[PDB]
Amino acid sequence: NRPNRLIVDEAINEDNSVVSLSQPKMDELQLFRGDTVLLKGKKRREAVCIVLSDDTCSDEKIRMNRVVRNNLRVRLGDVISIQPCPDVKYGKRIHVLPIDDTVEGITGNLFEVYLKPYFLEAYRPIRKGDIFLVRGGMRAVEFKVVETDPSPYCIVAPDTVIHCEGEPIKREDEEESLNEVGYDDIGGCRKQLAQIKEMVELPLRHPALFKAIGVKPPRGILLYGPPGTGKTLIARAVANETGAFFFLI
Amino acid sequence: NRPNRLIVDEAINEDNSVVSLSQPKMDELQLFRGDTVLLKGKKRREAVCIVLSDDTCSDEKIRMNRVVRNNLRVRLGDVISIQPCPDVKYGKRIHVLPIDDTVEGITGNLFEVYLKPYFLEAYRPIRKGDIFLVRGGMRAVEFKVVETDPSPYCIVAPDTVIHCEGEPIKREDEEESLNEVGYDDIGGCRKQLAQIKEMVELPLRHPALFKAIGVKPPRGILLYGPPGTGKTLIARAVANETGAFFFLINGPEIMSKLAGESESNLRKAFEEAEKNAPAIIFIDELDAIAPKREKTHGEVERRIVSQLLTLMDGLKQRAHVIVMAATNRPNSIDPALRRFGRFDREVDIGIPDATGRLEILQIHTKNMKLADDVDLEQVANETHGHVGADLAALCSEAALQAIRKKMDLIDLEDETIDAEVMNSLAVTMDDFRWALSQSNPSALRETVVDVPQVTWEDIGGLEDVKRELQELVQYPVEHPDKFLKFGMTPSKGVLFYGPPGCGKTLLAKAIANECQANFISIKGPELLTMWFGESEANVREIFDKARQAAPCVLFFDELDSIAKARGGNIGDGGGAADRVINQILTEMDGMSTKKNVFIIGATNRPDIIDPAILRPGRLDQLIYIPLPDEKSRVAILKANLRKSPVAKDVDLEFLAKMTNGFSGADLTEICQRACKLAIRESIESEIVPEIRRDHFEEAMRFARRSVSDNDIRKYEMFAQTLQQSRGF
Numbered sequence: 001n002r003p004n005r006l007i008v009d010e011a012i013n014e015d016n017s018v019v020s021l022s023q024p025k026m027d028e029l030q031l032f033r034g035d036t037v038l039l040k041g042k043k044r045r046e047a048v049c050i051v052l053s054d055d056t057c058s059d060e061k062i063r064m065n066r067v068v069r070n071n072l073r074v075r076l077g078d079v080i081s082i083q084p085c086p087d088v089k090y091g092k093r094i095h096v097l098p099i100d101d102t103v104e105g106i107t108g109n110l111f112e113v114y115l116k117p118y119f120l121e122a123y124r125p126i127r128k129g130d131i132f133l134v135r136g137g138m139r140a141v142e143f144k145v146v147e148t149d150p151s152p153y154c155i156v157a158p159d160t161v162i163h164c165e166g167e168p169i170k171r172e173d174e175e176e177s178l179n180e181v182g183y184d185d186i187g188g189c190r191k192q193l194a195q196i197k198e199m200v201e202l203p204l205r206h207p208a209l210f211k212a213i214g215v216k217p218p219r220g221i222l223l224y225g226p227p228g229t230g231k232t233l234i235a236r237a238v239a240n241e242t243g244a245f246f247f248l249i
Numbered sequence: 250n251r252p253n254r255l256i257v258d259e260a261i262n263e264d265n266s267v268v269s270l271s272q273p274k275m276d277e278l279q280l281f282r283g284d285t286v287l288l289k290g291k292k293r294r295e296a297v298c299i300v301l302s303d304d305t306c307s308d309e310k311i312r313m314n315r316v317v318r319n320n321l322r323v324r325l326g327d328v329i330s331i332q333p334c335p336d337v338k339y340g341k342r343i344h345v346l347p348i349d350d351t352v353e354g355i356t357g358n359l360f361e362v363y364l365k366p367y368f369l370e371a372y373r374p375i376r377k378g379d380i381f382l383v384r385g386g387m388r389a390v391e392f393k394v395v396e397t398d399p400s401p402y403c404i405v406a407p408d409t410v411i412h413c414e415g416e417p418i419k420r421e422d423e424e425e426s427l428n429e430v431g432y433d434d435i436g437g438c439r440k441q442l443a444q445i446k447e448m449v450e451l452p453l454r455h456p457a458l459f460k461a462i463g464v465k466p467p468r469g470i471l472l473y474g475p476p477g478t479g480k481t482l483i484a485r486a487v488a489n490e491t492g493a494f495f496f497l498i499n500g501p502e503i504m505s506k507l508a509g510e511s512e513s514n515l516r517k518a519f520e521e522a523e524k525n526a527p528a529i530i531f532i533d534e535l536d537a538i539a540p541k542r543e544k545t546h547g548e549v550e551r552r553i554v555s556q557l558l559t560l561m562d563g564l565k566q567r568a569h570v571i572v573m574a575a576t577n578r579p580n581s582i583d584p585a586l587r588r589f590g591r592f593d594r595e596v597d598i599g600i601p602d603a604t605g606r607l608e609i610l611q612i613h614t615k616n617m618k619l620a621d622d623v624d625l626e627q628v629a630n631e632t633h634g635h636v637g638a639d640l641a642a643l644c645s646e647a648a649l650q651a652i653r654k655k656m657d658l659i660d661l662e663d664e665t666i667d668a669e670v671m672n673s674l675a676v677t678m679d680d681f682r683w684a685l686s687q688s689n690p691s692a693l694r695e696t697v698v699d700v701p702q703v704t705w706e707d708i709g710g711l712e713d714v715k716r717e718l719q720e721l722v723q724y725p726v727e728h729p730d731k732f733l734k735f736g737m738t739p740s741k742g743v744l745f746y747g748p749p750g751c752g753k754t755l756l757a758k759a760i761a762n763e764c765q766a767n768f769i770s771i772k773g774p775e776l777l778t779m780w781f782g783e784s785e786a787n788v789r790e791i792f793d794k795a796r797q798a799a800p801c802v803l804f805f806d807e808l809d810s811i812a813k814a815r816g817g818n819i820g821d822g823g824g825a826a827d828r829v830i831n832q833i834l835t836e837m838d839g840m841s842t843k844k845n846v847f848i849i850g851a852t853n854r855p856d857i858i859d860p861a862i863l864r865p866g867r868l869d870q871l872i873y874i875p876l877p878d879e880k881s882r883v884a885i886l887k888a889n890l891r892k893s894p895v896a897k898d899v900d901l902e903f904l905a906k907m908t909n910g911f912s913g914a915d916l917t918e919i920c921q922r923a924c925k926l927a928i929r930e931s932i933e934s935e936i937v938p939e940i941r942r943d944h945f946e947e948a949m950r951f952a953r954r955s956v957s958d959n960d961i962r963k964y965e966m967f968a969q970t971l972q973q974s975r976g977f
């Protein structure tokens with residue numbers, strides 16, 4: 001029923017928004033390697049991205065990047081609604097504005113350092129109200145388009161002009177700070193992260209189901225190891241990747 | 250007088266309401282196997298059920314299920330009034346309603362999952378206002394009929410229609426919650442439960458009788474055992490199965506209070522217990538509040554201990570108050586508490602055995618749905634160091650693993666899933682295997698007190714020593730009358746000596762198995778490491794533990810390691826007696842003769858064993874186990890090859906005559922090498938499943954002898970002259 005629902009979990013490609021599917025999926029959804037796809041999430045918001053051909057990922061799973069995970073307001077293990085978009089898009093004007101929480105201490109023409117060698121030779125699609133992360137200059141800033149042609153009808157093209165404004169917009173509470181620690185900020189602990197996920201996220205993400213079943217949830221997880229191994233980092237990441245209230249003692 | 254009164258005690262049939270009587274009873278009450286009977290209890294209420302034919306239950310007892318025990322408002326040990334009901338009954342309409350305390354979180358048509366595959370092929374009777382328990386969908390809910398034809402006039406029939414209402418009724422205080430812990434919620438502890446019942450329920454159930462007699466009631470029951478063994482569970486069950494007010498005191502909770510406020514809490518708890526009828530005070534984690542006063546820092550803790558001692562000493566027989574305590578560290582308890590008048594009865598809740606842990610697994614999976622390949626007996630056999638908490642965690646992990654593969658069939662978008670899919674989710678044996686794969690047994694280091702599985706069939710030859718061990722162990726425990734007639738006190742000790750790998754450990758385990766007696770194995774290296782902490786009380790605890798397990802056999806294996814700690818009898822000139830061995834001799838001399846504890850020692854270094862071990866009264870039965878001869882080698886090979894698919898052309902007597910100085914371990918090594926060659930052949934052929942003659946020939950080509958001819962001569966010398974030893 002409804003062969004359009006995808007399970008959301010973290011991707012492995014260390015790049016910008018690029019979704020990865022399994023071998024039967026691009027043939028079942030009649031989309032090729034270099035195709036434009038549309039992501040639809042909760043709270044009546046959309047996302048547009050480019051698929052990637054993968055085989056040794058899983059039987060039925062999409063791969064979801066953290067850059068646009070907050071764009072759809074969806075966390076780990078969520079269900080997403082995909083849709084192929086065989087619509088030709090080209091950008092003419094895209095009024096883009098950074099956020100004055102991560103761009104402080106940076107001056108000059110930020111385009112030629114951050115946006116210019118990030119757009120060309122990529123051909124990425126941009127939707128209305130997209131928060132995409134750009135790394136460079138020994139720091140990372142997220143960026144926000146605020147005004148363009150009707151959504152999305154936009155891909156990265158050399159024929160797209162841009163203009164700076166010099167007044168970055170503030171960050172509202174509707175979105176989560178990408179500067180916070182996530183699952184992608186932990187390296188070298190994937191088995192431990194897998195165990196923590198299996199023991200933590202299912203009861204937290206589905207509290208009503210776990211209350212209905214009446215089965216014992218593991219509530220005494222104890223991390224241990226040598227100092228500086230990321231125990232606090234892992235705990236904060238698990239807190240952030242789930243919609244659970246976090247109290248620190 | 251009145252041959253209609255029945256004593257009420259818990260049943261053994263793991264089903265719905267089915268009463269079980271003794272052989273003379275159904276003939277005396279003219280009722281057959283498939284007959285309808287009527288149960289009449291107190292407070293003017295009745296119950297209807299179906300009898301069961303039983304013979305090996307007791308002389309005069311009924312068996313009463315917990316489902317309908319609360320239906321009659323009768324507890325354990327009560328007297329019930331039975332009546333046969335040869336009245337034909339058939340249900341037409343039965344308005345049934347659940348209770349909204351256990352059905353929350355369940356939606357959909359609960360009939361087709363819970364009531365439909367529970368009614369048919371059963372033909373059970375239903376009475377007015379019956380609370381019957383139905384398990385399924387990884388949870389248990391009780392159910393209540395509220396309206397039907399005049400009572401009871403109802404049995405389960407396919408012609409009975411039903412209709413849902415969607416509004417479950419609330420639970421009143423007239424009945425007890427079946428979700429609470431009862432006697433049936435504890436597995437693997439029946440002897441301990443029997444002792445607790447005998448020591449607790451008679452004074453509590455009959456306080457007036459115990460006050461009239463003027464005899465001392467045991468008021469200091471102290472439960473102890475490894476953590477997670479169900480001490481709290483047992484205490485709560487005993488509280489629930491008797492009509493005694495239960496006051497719970499938590500160690501850490503009391504200790505967390507401010508100074509001068511915890512004493513107020515203890516005094517208030519004792520006052521409440523004394524005021525409110527017969528009562529039980531349970532102090533969970535007693536070592537938290539009352540450690541050894543020699544090892545404690547603050548004076549507030551000592552005030553707490555003194556207050557507890559005063560409150561315990563202030564207990565009168567008229568108070569009808571029983572104080573129970575649980576601690577996983579009984580030796581950390583202040584010794585003043587364990588004296589007479591405060592805590593005299595001590596009950597050891599030990600690690601469950603294979604049967605006990607199988608019972609625990611059944612108790613924890615009875616709510617879950619198991620696939621047809623689920624072998625709970627195999628799971629119990631594969632779990633060794635697990636305790637009740639470990640098995641509960643294993644079952645929960647298996648259920649979670651089953652759910653984790655069902656996240657798509659279950660709409661995770663939906664708030665509260667319905668039971669028509671929850672029951673469809675079944676826990677496979679693969680899920681149990683996965684859960685067992687990653688599990689940490691807590692009681693791995695604990696000493697095992699159990700009947701070993703190895704029997705005489707696992708031992709080849711050695712018939713004479715088998716007969717001698719039978720005469721030494723079975724006869725004093727089976728026919729004491731002959732021994733007291735002829736006036737000889739049985740010998741309490743046996744020492745096994747001989748070449749290594751000839752079956753000294755197997756003999757002790759097999760003689761433990763045949764007598765069906767508890768077996769405790771203490772190895773020499775274990776003693777040497779457990780004494781290195783200068784803990785003289787541990788080897789005393791070993792003998793104490795053996796004392797409570799009587800009839801028990803205490804086996805000290807690898808005494809050579811103990812004797813090699815200081816070199817031996819001659820060595821460089823000093824003696825090998827050190828550390829444990831002196832305390833072991835002291836314990837052997839200080840053990841009661843009438844106790845059925847038997848001590849067996851084994852060593853393959855008879856030269857260096859200290860003489861004091863061999864003194865009469867400690868270990869005077871010197872049994873020498875030699876290397877197997879021709880026929881014993883055939884027997885050993887046959888015993889070792891029982892579990893392997895040996896081909897017909899394999900000539901075992903040929904192998905026996907081709908091996909002369911080989912011991913049992915050497916023959917086992919030969920069999921293992923032949924099996925490993927067969928495994929290699931199978932692996933190579935994969936890129937047949939019968940071990941052949943050629944494999945045995947190739948294994949015999951590389952077979953090695955682990956006992957020298959000079960060693961054989963020396964053992965023969967010690968086989969004849971070892972009683973001498975002591976003296977020079």
Ligand SMILES: Nc1ncnc2c1ncn2[C@@H]1O[C@H](COP(=O)(O)OP(=O)(O)OP(O)(O)=S)[C@@H](O)[C@H]1O
Pocket residue numbers: 185186187188189226227228229230231232233234
């Ligand atoms: N596995 C890791 N992956 C990425 N960064 C890591 C990892 N482990 C440590 N770090 C970095 O090192 C910092 C220190 O790690 P912490 O989690 O704060 O130390 P810790 O694990 O709490 O151990 P303590 O606090 O000294 S006992 C983190 O904030 C990260 O920046």
Ligand SMILES: Nc1ncnc2c1ncn2[C@@H]1O[C@H](COP(=O)(O)OP(=O)(O)OP(O)(O)=S)[C@@H](O)[C@H]1O
Pocket residue numbers: 434435436437438475476477478479480481482483575576577609612636637638639641
């Ligand atoms: N013999 C048993 N039969 C059935 N369930 C058991 C048994 N032993 C333990 N359990 C289960 O394991 C849980 C933990 O047991 P508890 O009695 O709470 O532990 P404990 O005996 O108090 O030992 P502590 O508190 O760690 S010192 C119980 O609530 C049961 O669910």
Ligand SMILES: Nc1ncnc2c1ncn2[C@@H]1O[C@H](COP(=O)(O)OP(=O)(O)OP(O)(O)=S)[C@@H](O)[C@H]1O
Pocket residue numbers: 707708709710711748749750751752753754755756851853884885888889912913914917
């Ligand atoms: N009579 C026997 N019948 C069958 N197998 C035997 C026999 N004697 C020894 N074995 C094998 O040898 C192994 C060791 O048995 P043990 O009773 O431990 O021998 P032991 O005399 O105690 O000497 P060690 O030091 O323990 S090897 C057993 O597990 C069997 O595989």
Ligand SMILES: [Mg+2]
Pocket residue numbers: 231232
């Ligand atoms: Mg830390």
Ligand SMILES: [Mg+2]
Pocket residue numbers: 480481533534575
């Ligand atoms: Mg407890």
Ligand SMILES: [Mg+2]
Pocket residue numbers: 753754806807
């Ligand atoms: Mg041995």
